[PDB]
Amino acid sequence: DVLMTQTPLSLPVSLGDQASISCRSSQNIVHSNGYTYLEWYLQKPGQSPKLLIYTVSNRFSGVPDRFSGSGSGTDFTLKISRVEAEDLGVYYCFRGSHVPTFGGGTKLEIKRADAAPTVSIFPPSSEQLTSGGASVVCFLNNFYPKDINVKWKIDGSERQNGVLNSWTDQDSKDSTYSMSSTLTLTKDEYERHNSYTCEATHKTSTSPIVKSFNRNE
Amino acid sequence: EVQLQQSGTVLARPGASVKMSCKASGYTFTNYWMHWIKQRPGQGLEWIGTIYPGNSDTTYSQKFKGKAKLTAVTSTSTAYMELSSLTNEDSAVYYCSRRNYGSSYAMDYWGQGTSVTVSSAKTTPPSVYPLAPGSNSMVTLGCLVKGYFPEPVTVTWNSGSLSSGVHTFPAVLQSDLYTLSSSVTVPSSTWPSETVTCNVAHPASSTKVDKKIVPRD
Known part of the structure; x- marks a missing residue:
């Protein structure tokens, strides 16, 4: 039919x-x-x-x-x-x-060939915090295969809320994939903690890639 | 030489209706059947219906009766599709294409597509935030374009000079608001030694912002 x-x-x-x-x-x-x-x-x-x-x-x-x-x-x-x-x-x-x-x-x-991503984490910008918002961005660039997992951690605990991810189309030149994950919180909740983490588990490893930053540093 | 040019992007509100056009040239407009195809974002093509400009004959996919209304104007070599009672489900790109017979029996020429966004949210400039690294031979910087509507937006680094090592991610829906981010990787001897700037151009609100990536500590 x-x-x-x-x-x-x-x-x-x-x-x-x-x-x-x-x-x-x-x-x-x-x-x-x-x-x-x-x-x-x-x-x-x-x-x-x-x-x-x-x-x-x-x-x-x-x-x-x-x-x-x-x-x-x-x-x-x-x-x-x-x-x-x-x-x-x-x-x-x-x-x-x-x-x-x-x-x-x-x-x-x-x-x-399998390629591990390159992870980079970025704390909120002074301009955003001034607005009352607090976005923490993490880039996982040029990796393959696409199947990838990103997990956020605020002071060790996993957070699923306010997390948004976006993926790029397989790059026509190098055939890798890139991803951007964004954890959004208000400034007040952002400043009630210290360590923000971005974790990526990819077919290329057992020991996941971890990139963090302390608000107190 | 046959080419189909379609009308420009459109933003409509639920319950409204829009009319788009498909200007044809390169062949005898009235001899071939003109088809219409829909494509929801991140989805597959879907046949809408067709019309024979020669004598205004039409055929629709049961799914589009009362939703789509096709017409053609001989004199202007222009086909038109009018969508009524719009909903979010109608948000998509719509292509027109000519079905050839003889040399080939298929849709050989397509329009560039008309984008339609159904939403009851008004134009909102984006807030652009610099993503500088907290504290390697290459270094990754970023740009966070947040809370704008509707699509699209232009992001370049340094007016365009910086092209490679860039990854502008797809826009994600942030509650009636769009959000995307862009990353760029450059030599350590280039930045922070030399400033880097992201350019964000929001058509819908005729906004153009330049953001410098300032180091931190």
Whole structure:
């Protein structure tokens, strides 16, 4: 019943490797005229989707051989013979016959060597404290894989409230990821404690990376 | 040479309705079907509906009947999508694209996309805070842009000279208010020896602030 399902949700592949993106429809999607309008589109961060494959296996003017589209009936596949760094982004299959439907998309991430993040912590600025607020920022830059955990500690105790994180898209140049976690408290609660901590646990280590600062220093 | 230019970013209030346009050129506007696609932030594409500018023929995805209203104006080679009874769920980028037949059978050309934000919060300049390290060969500095609305915002370091080693994180929702941060890494012999400044430009409130990163102790 129209559902266009894609797998995997996220596909990690080192440069030069092969990539297989699957797309299944819940019903036979062949048009009464005999043709099968299944298309594939690619969309990189902050850009408009691009056409790669139409009618299942046909490539669009300007798309390299490395891209293959196969399948029929209810199953279709997209293959990237030799993944480049410029291939990362999200791939969507699209059924173009009546009641056009997009698949969920398959994020193509480029695999590189594991890299531990570089953590940096920053106390509130005098200007903010003057405003009555108190933000403590912590940057965890250029790490891989993305799977990362940040835990805040005010005088040893974990704090989950007022914590906001944001992540960058895999860097097109070095394929690393970066994250920024921000613990926000009012100035008064900020000044009733002394040691603020930022902890990051990442696949690259057992002993997590800890960066702190004492208000009394 | 075929290109679709779409109207600019829009901020609307719940219950309101907005109308966007898709100006086409490069082909015979009235011969091809023009499609519309929605994309919630951090989400996949979704087919909205289509219209045949030739004779104002339309088709909508059941999900968009009464929500979207498509029209085209032959003489101006312009397609329009009007969204009514807006809610947060309609906040997204909307693309228009031409479906070609012959050389290819798909959506080969897309618009740059129109951004729509549904919210009942007014323009608010951002407060910019310097993130200096408390107390290595490289050193990381930062800039905290907090409490602004709506998107977007421009952040550069030193008018732009400092480009590499920068990580401006995605804006996060802070209760009807947006918040992002930017980090930059430079040589120890460069800073604090030489001052570093972040520039924050908030379009919506025509605000431009320059913040120096002053060391501490």
